[PDB]
Ligand SMILES: NC(=O)c1ccc[n+]([C@@H]2O[C@H](COP(=O)([O-])OP(=O)(O)OC[C@H]3O[C@@H](n4cnc5c(N)ncnc54)[C@H](O)[C@@H]3O)[C@@H](O)[C@H]2O)c1
């Protein structure tokens with residue numbers, strides 16, 4: 314396993330260098346998001362909090378949602394320090410009725426959301442037979458079902474004006490799988506599927522102004538899960554993931570992997586049947 | 599589009615011939631399923647009904663589940679004609695409490711299930727803004743959440759005996775997407791994710807005796823979806839899909855696409871230059887009755 318470990322380091326180094334080379338040779342155009350009404354769910358901590366900071370620097374109008382009232386007020390105070398106008402609401406993003414009532418409030422107090430970042434997430438790591446049925450339902454209610462209710466509530470206005478951006482925060486767990494996270498991986502696959510089907514349906518209907526982005530990071534140091542011993546993937550910092558997300562949104566990138574070189578592990582999976590799967594699985598344990 | 603059509607036709611003719619060549623050069627071993635207790639969900643019609651017929655010919659003991667008592671008893675009558683012992687139960691496979699109570703009944707009247715075929719599914723074709731929230735919940739309750747409850751109830755015995763086979767009936771919609779089927783595609787991606795994560799967790803735990811299979815067919819002529827039309831994929835017959843499934847199960851195949859050459863369309867998607875996606879989308883011309891605006 315020494316040879317495959319060093320080979321993958323070089324493949325990672327080659328991809329990371331060639332990406333930065335293409336980023337200078339063929340730069341992608343960056344749109345403006347100043348004055349857009351951006352709703353961010355799960356904005357009281359982690360990826361959502363630092364994504365709100367990126368949108369505050371971008372001069373957007375923010376609408377922050379979370380069940381953690383103290384947390385979302387801490388994010389809002391920093392966004393205001395950054396010069397942004399912020400509105401916070403305590404919303405359970407896995408409760409359909411709470412979402413619809415809160416959208417009525419956002420329309421009355423702020424206006425029509427133009428960028429939706431479905432970031433709120435939940436996880437209860439455990440093997441399948443050690444999970445609680447309530448936790449499995451909670452995982453689907455927040456990680457995918459809530460994406461349907463928020464998107465359904467906010468899409469009508471975006472379609473009317475032919476202008477919007479729906480961002481789905483999924484995970485590399487929506488493309489690949491990790492043991493002890495069966496319900497979580499299943500809901501993250503569901504999140505990727507929703508992003509892909511929504512993207513295709515907007516093209517089929519002739520709706521050219523509504524963009525879609527899907528954020529798929531590896532483990533991020535937010536406290537979301539206990540720290541692992543992952544030698545191949547990096548233990549990302551929150552600010553780095555929020556920077557990758559804002560860059561992807563401004564550039565209309567449909568699938569944003571963090572780190573971007575994760576796409577090689579995905580390409581290797583579709584061309585690997587099947588004894589070489591376990592060899593790379595033990596290089597990260 | 600004449601040039602790209604012949605390029606796709608050649609890649610389908612070559613795959614179908616090379617598969618039959620590998621099927622003779624490196625044949626896969628077919629296990630026996632005689633005497634296994636096989637639970638088939640949604641067995642009152644379509645894929646589930648004809649899969650039950652394949653397992654009846656294989657000499658397994660069948661446990662058929664469905665909300666339609668009339669249909670599941672009609673499938674059981676034919677399985678009995680085929681020489682099989684069959685037990686039917688009226689179970690809502692999207693209801694957690696109904697599932698657990700029914701598993702207690704299956705243990706008392708039949709025994710411990712060894713092969714679970716999570717086949718029951720639903721779909722409500724419509725664009726996202728024309729869907730009903732009840733339909734979105736129903737889609738997830740049956741197409742994925744029910745897979746969790748049934749698997750959780752039946753896995754303990756399989757782990758105790760180091761012997762089982764969990765079959766998840768997903769769709770090509772769990773790998774790719776079709777417009778007017780956003781909630782359905784999302785639920786089918788979740789079914790594929792569950793199959794893949796369950797497969798990996800069994801390996802990680804050292805459980806070697808529990809096999810997993812995932813059935814991913816294109817449109818099948820079962821009435822599930824109305825007037826399906828595909829210019830590049832065929833409109834499959836039910837018996838063909840049930841034959842592909844039984845062959846995959848007996849051979850411990852993890853991902854069963856019907857037709858098997860669909861894997862080329864999936865490989866082409868991961869090496870897609872954006873402008874070539876729309877060219878094959880218009881040549882495919884996927885049609886089916888759905889609620890688009892009205
Ligand atoms: N942290 C990682 O390692 C990681 C890996 C990839 C993807 N993700 C995904 O990124 C997203 C954010 O994760 P994070 O690491 O920033 O987590 P975090 O714990 O730092 O913050 C998540 C936030 O979501 C909020 N939230 C939870 N349930 C909610 C609900 N019902 N309604 C509203 N808000 C709710 C929490 O209160 C919290 O403020 C999630 O979707 C997660 O699955 C995380």
Ligand SMILES: NC(=O)c1ccc[n+]([C@@H]2O[C@H](COP(=O)([O-])OP(=O)(O)OC[C@H]3O[C@@H](n4cnc5c(N)ncnc54)[C@H](O)[C@@H]3O)[C@@H](O)[C@H]2O)c1
Pocket residue numbers: 639640641642643644645646663664665666669689690691692717718719720740767768769770814815816817818819820821822823
């Ligand atoms: N038909 C296709 O074109 C097609 C394409 C690929 C995948 N699939 C999948 O194959 C599976 C079977 O579909 P089909 O075409 O055989 O459908 P079908 O309509 O022929 O039969 C489905 C059966 O499931 C039963 N069922 C529905 N809801 C149930 C519930 N709550 N509890 C128990 N039983 C329930 C129905 O009563 C019916 O007997 C589904 O998971 C479907 O998504 C179908």
Ligand SMILES: O=C(NC[C@]1(O)CC[C@H](COc2ccccc2F)CC1)c1ccc(O)c(F)c1
Pocket residue numbers: 438483484485486491492493494530531532538539540541598802
């Ligand atoms: O890395 C993420 N979590 C890490 C854990 O907190 C700790 C490790 C276990 C997996 O354990 C093993 C795997 C293989 C062999 C033996 C193990 F013990 C999963 C939970 C994580 C969490 C969310 C994500 O979205 C994501 F991409 C990654």
